[model samples]
Every structure is written in structure tokens, then in C-alpha cells.
Target: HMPFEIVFDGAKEFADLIATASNLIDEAAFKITEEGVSMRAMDPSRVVLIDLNLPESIFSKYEVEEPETIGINMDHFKKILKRGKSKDTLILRKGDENFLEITFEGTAKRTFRLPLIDVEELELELPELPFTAKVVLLGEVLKEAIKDASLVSDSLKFIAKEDEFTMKAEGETNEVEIKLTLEDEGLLDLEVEEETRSAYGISYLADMVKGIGKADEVTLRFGTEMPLQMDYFIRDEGKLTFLLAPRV
Candidate 1:
């Protein structure tokens, strides 16, 4: 039997991240190693792919005798996280019966058991696409743009040029467009090899960024009628990246 132990100092923050990912995929396999933990999964419709990496520096304590991969029911795992308090610390350990033991330590100690499932090991290979534009801006800014676009139509267009970034949607009765220039305070930086525009399903794009609101900044890569990639960086913690296929 393999023994594993890990502790997170910021339980609420970590739980929120996992819960956000669970919103997109129900089950996920986490690859654990002495370096840390990582997970990759694609949505049911295969429209969006998520890659999450957490380095050992993010955890208060991490110990693994050997590297291992474990499949977890994200829904059940998220439910257990709901019991955590803001001041609580989280502890995860391997149980004797292929179970995962979760503990919340704070004003009161709470423990929960979760069974592990056998998930077919997947080797996800991310495609290297030639992107034309990249924008670095506040996550909240991007979230607001997506929310505004949702009001106009089910699909939104992303436009990137030499000096500006734009999102527009057209409905039967109304059209909405949001543009941000390089000088915009919310936009930290912008780069464009060539002007590019693409349309994407709003629902998929919205769901993909649900967890990024907590992040201070997010990087967006765009191509002409190609996949859109969003990268959320958490300073020294780790990073979460989402790749969404554009609507044809």
C-alpha cells in the first residue's frame, strides 16, 4: 500500500479552485508526485480543456513515498470542501482501503472519507497552435466582458488588433460591443502578430472562466478562427489554463 499525506494552509482558496474545475468536469484524475499535484480534463462536449498544476511550494506540507495517480469524483470532493471554514486548514491522507481521508482543522475538527475509483489513465497532449494575438488583463475585466456579451447573444466575437481588444455580440434586436485600447487601465499589456477575430460559444467561454474571478490577472491568446487559450496565474502558487475551441 502506498502512503500519501498533504496539507494546505489556505483551505478555502484551494477548495474554491477545485470546486470551480468540478463545475466543468465531474470526474478528474490527479497526478501526485514529490513535486506536487496536477490535473487535466476536457469537458463532456470536448469544447474546453483544463490544465491545473500546483507546485509543492503551494502546500504547507507534502509527502509522498512514491508518485501516484488517483481518480476522484469531483462532485463528491467538492461537497466535502463545502464544510471547510475560512480559518481552517485542510489535510489529505491515504486510507487503508483505497479511501481518501480529508480533515479540516480549525475551531472544530471534521473528517470525511471518499472512495477512489479506477479511471483509465489518459495521456492528454495539448496542441501547439500558432496564435496571432495575446492580451494580459485583469480577470474581472474579462469576466465582465463575457457577462456583457452574454446579454446580447449566445455567441460572442473576439477581436484583437495592434492597439485594441474587443468583444462583440449581436442579437436579433440588439448588438453590444466592448473595446479596450492598449491605454486602458484594466488592460495591462497587449501583443498582436496580426489582427485576428473569432467567434465562440458564450456558454463554453463563460463556464471556462468561472474560477478565474479570484485571480488578479489572466492571459488570453487568440488566433483567427482557432482555439482560444486563457491562462490564470496565481503568483507563486501555480497556474490554471483553459483552452476552448472556437465555434465554426
Candidate 2:
């Protein structure tokens, strides 16, 4: 069993990340290195990978000494974290070789443990993504873009140019395009020496946006045939950062 301490802080944001991330994977192995904690989850479709890294500074008090990596269902842990009170000390321990038990230490204490599941085993061969241009826009913009794109088609096409970035979807009788221009303050920065275009599932992009709410802006990078990379950069004094690979 693994045991660790957590100082209460932002539980909702933490829980949201786990909830949105688990939709991509059933069981994930979390690694706690000397620098911080890191986890990676690959969806069965093998089209998306959610990478999370959090350091000790994010927690009020953090200590993890166990070396045995437990494969716990992220959904179960996320549920527990959702109940955890802000500023509460979260104690996480191993229930068995495969299970994990979590306790929220606060005014209203709660505890729960979840058993591991037999996740499908597969070799994930991710394609090489050589992105040429990246655009940084607020999370709300992409969220709205996904919502509007789904109305016209199942897939959305992303186009980035020297001055603007746009996402479009078209069907038999309808088409929608959400554009962000450098002139708008919403478009923080646009580095486009070469243009890149690609298509991906709008549903995946919608779910992926759920975890990105904490950040004001999200960094999106894409190529002609490469996967879309979204970075939800957070403030922890250089403690935590979340990266999500959108389906293609």
C-alpha cells in the first residue's frame, strides 16, 4: 500500500483534471519521482494521451515514499477527490498491491478505497507529430469552437496561418468556422512560419476541454498530419502542468 500526505488547497481544479482525464483511460500508473508526481494515460483508441505532472509545492505538505506503483481506476479516485474539502489534508494509501485508499482530512472527513480493474493491454504506437504553428487562445474560445463545430459535423478541421487560427466543420448542408485573429486580445500569440491543417473528432475535443477550465489560455499545436496538442498551463510557481493530446 502506498501512503502519502496532502495539504488542502484547490480540490475542485484537481478533481476536474482527474475526472476529465479518466475518460481517456481506465487504469493508469502514477509515478512519484524526487522532483514531483507524473502520470500518463492512453485511450484505447490510442489517439489521445493525457499527461499530468504536479510537484510538492502545490500541496501544503507532500510526502510519498512507496515504490510500488498501483494501477487504480482514475474515475474512482476522482470521485473521492471531488468530496475532498478545500484546504483539507488528503491522505492516500495503497489498499492492496493493486488498490488505493484515500482519506480527506478536514472538518468533514471522508474515506474510500477502490479496487483495480483489468484494463485492456495494448501497444500504443503514437504517431510522430511535427507541428509547424501553434496558437495560444483562451479556454472558452476552444470550448465554444468545439460546441459549435459539433452541430455541423463529427470532425473539425483546424487551420493555422501567420495571422490567424481557425476551426471549421462542414456537413451536407451546414458549415461552421470559429476564427481567432492576432488583432484580438483573445489571441495571445501566433507563431506561424508554416501553415498546418488537420482533422479530429469534435467529441474528444469537447471532453478534453473540461480539464482546461483552470487556465485562462490554452496552447494548441498542430501539423498537416499530426495530432493536436493542448497545454493547460497552471500556476504553481512552476509546480504543475497538464498536457492533453486531442483525437485525430
Candidate 3:
């Protein structure tokens, strides 16, 4: 028998993580172990890939007799998480017959049980990408740029050079461009091994970065015609990385 339980001090932050993942996929499988929980999946369109890792240190309480894998419907899980309050403590436990139990402990304790489905156990092989450009900036910067680009076109171009990083979108008659230089306050760090530029679907990227606004900083890595990887980190908590294929 596999019995495991984990408790989170606050549910709001955790809910944000779940919401981010659910935005890209309808279903997901989580592997729970003594270390923590991890999930990796690609969207149905195969354009966006996500990798999520939560270390046990992030939890208020964690207990695991053995490792276990549970499949969940992202939509249902996200819906349940919506009921969580800021001060609520979340508890997750494995129940009998492939059932997962979720409890929110707060001023008013709420409990929910969701059935687990059988998901195919497949290895997610991440390709080795040679990124020529890397930029570290505040999540707010990227989010705002994406929002600005949406006004002109459905796709946006990311260009990086030795001294500047730029995001541009062009329409039939008008264009929007946001440029940040190494000397800019918004750019925390910038590295360009080789000048590179690529265009990506703005809507897909906008959706993937929804949760990143809460993060202090985000790192972007990409090469010409290569997939763009955006990484969000929460100190010692965990990391949520998204890889979106470039639009040819």
C-alpha cells in the first residue's frame, strides 16, 4: 500500500502554480516522492512544453512511505483550487482505489475528493538546445511587453544583441516595439553568445506567462529558429519552465 501526504502552509501560491500548468494542458500526471512532486508535459499542439518541480522543503509538512504517481484532470483540479483562500492550508493525501483527497484547512475547513485516472507513463525527453541569447528580467517587463504586442499582431519577435533585447510586433499599418538595454533598470542580466532573433505566437506565450507575474524575475533563453524557454523560480521552493517552439 502506498500512503503519502503533504501539507502546504498557504494555498494561494500553490493554486497559482496549478493554474499555470492547467492553462497549457487539460490533463497532467504528478510523481510524488520523498523529495517532492514533479510533472512534465507538452501541450496537445506540441508547441508548448512544461516542466514543474516542487521540492519537499516548500511544504509545511511532508510524509511519504513510498513513491506514487497520480493522474489528474487539470480543469477539475484547477476548479477545486479556485475555492482556496489566501490563508487556507492545503493537504493532499492518497486514498483508496485511485482516489486523491484534498483538504483546505482555514477558518472553514473544506474537503474534496477527486478520482485519479490512468495516464500513460511516458518519458519526456527534453532536447538539448543551443541557446545563443539569454536575458534575465523582471516578470512584469515580459508580461507588459506581451500585452503591448497583442495590440498589433498575433505573433511577436524576440531579438537579442550584445547590448540590447527587443520585442517587436508589426501589423498592416502600425508596429509596437519594446526595447531594453543592458543599462536599463528592467534588465537584470543579459548575455548574447551570438546575436539571435525569432518570432513566436504571442497568445501561447501570453498564456504560459500568466503566473509569472508573481515571480520576481524570469530568465529567457533562445536561439534563432529555436524554441524559447522561459523559466520562473521561487528561491528554494520550485521552478516552472516553459518551452515554446518558434513560429516558422
Candidate 4:
């Protein structure tokens, strides 16, 4: 049996993380190492790639004897994690057999043993991408923008300039544009090497933004007709990168 057990402080946060991830992929293999638990997955459509990590700093207790990748049913795992309370502590342990032991320690200690599934490893090399536009703002800002755009169309266009950032959606009802200037309060940082525009479907974005709740700010990186990169800071210790392909 490998001494692989990690204690995460916020039960609610852990649940939220898994819930967001499950929205994109039904199954994922999380790699456990001395550093922490890391997971990467590409959606069935192959339009989005998700990279997530729970660093040792975020865990109350972290122990790992050797590296191990455990495939799991994300939906089932999120359900078990949801059983935890806000004040509860989450503990995950890999047993001698092929099962994951999850425990919620709160007013009472509750535990569940989830059967491991066989998920093929996502052998993906993190692609190196170039960007012409970057924006840093509160996670809520972008989440709200995405929500507003969804009303008008299935997809939205992002336009960026030296002093401005915009999210626009067009349908029969004119266009819904949420424009932000560099001087705006929520707009922390904005840079545009060249005027850039990119469009993306609202399909995966709605769920992907859910993880933003855990981070203070998310960095938006994209280029003209290129993939959009969302870096959601995790506990000031790590980042959860959500890369989505462009509509064009």
C-alpha cells in the first residue's frame, strides 16, 4: 500500500473544484506525487483542455510514497465530495486495492470508498501558444460577462485594444456588449500588442468559469483566431488553466 493520503482544509472548495471539472470531462486520471494532486483532461469534442492542480500548500496534510495515477468517475467523485459540509475537512487516501478513500471530517466523520475506473491517460503535451491580448480582472467579472453573452447567442466574440476590453454577442436583438476601459475598477490589467478578436461558443465556458469562484482574479490570454487561455489562480499556490479553442 502506498502511503498516499492528502488532507484538504476547505471541504466546500474541494467539492466546487471537482464539480467544475466534471462538467467538462466525465472521467479523469489524477496524478498523485510528492508535490500534490494534478489532473489534466481534454473534452470529448477535443475543443478544450483542462489543467488543474491542488498543491501541498492547500492541503493540511500531504503524504506520498511514490507517484500514482488513479482514474476516477468525475461525476461520482463530485457527488461524494458534495456530501461534505462547508466547515468539514476533506481527506483522500488510496488504499492497497484499487479504490479511493474519501472522508469528510466535520461535526461527524463520514467516509466513502469509491471504485476506481479505467480511464486512459490523457497523453497531451501542453501546447505553447502566443497571445496578442491579455486581461486580468476579478473572476466574477468574466463569469458575469459570459453569462450575459449567452442570452443573445450560442457564441461570443472577445475584442481587445490598448485601452479597452470588450465581450460582445449578437443575435436578432442587436448586440450585448460589456465594454471595460483600463481605468475601470474591476479591470486590474489590460495589454494589447495588437488589436485582437476571437470568438468562442458558450458551450464549455459556462461550467469552466465555475472554478473562478475560488480564485481572486483570472488572467485572460488569447490571440486573433487562436485559443483562449484562462488562468485561474488557485490559493496563491497554483493555477488551473482552461484552454478553449476558438470558434473560427
lDDT of candidates 1 onward, in order: 0.86, 0.69, 0.89, 0.87
Model 4 segments more than 4 A misplaced: none
Give Cα distance to truth, residue 131, candidate 4, Å.
1.1
Q: Candidate 1, residues 1-248: lDDT per residue as tens digits?
A: 47899999767877888877887888889989999899999888878888899998888899888888899999999999888887899999995579899999998889999999877756686788899999998878888888998988999999999999998999999998988887787788899999999999999888877777744788899799999998876545788888889999
Model 3 bad stretches (over 4 Å): none
What is the clash tally of candidate 3?
A: 0
TM-score: which is higher, 1 or 2? 1
lDDT of 3 at 229: 93
Task: List where candidate 2 sits over 4 angstroms from the true fold.
Answer: 6-8, 94-99, 116-128, 236-248
Name model 1 segments beyond 4 Å from true.
Answer: none
Looking at model 1, which ten-residue stretch has the lowest summed lDDT?
208-217
Residue pairs in steric clash, candidate 2?
A: 2-94, 8-87, 8-88
Q: After superposition, how far is residue 59 of candidate 1 from its true place, in Å?
A: 0.5
Taking all chains together, each candidate's TM-score versus the true structure is 0.95, 0.85, 0.96, 0.95
What is the lDDT, from 0 to 100, of the residue 146 in candidate 4? 87
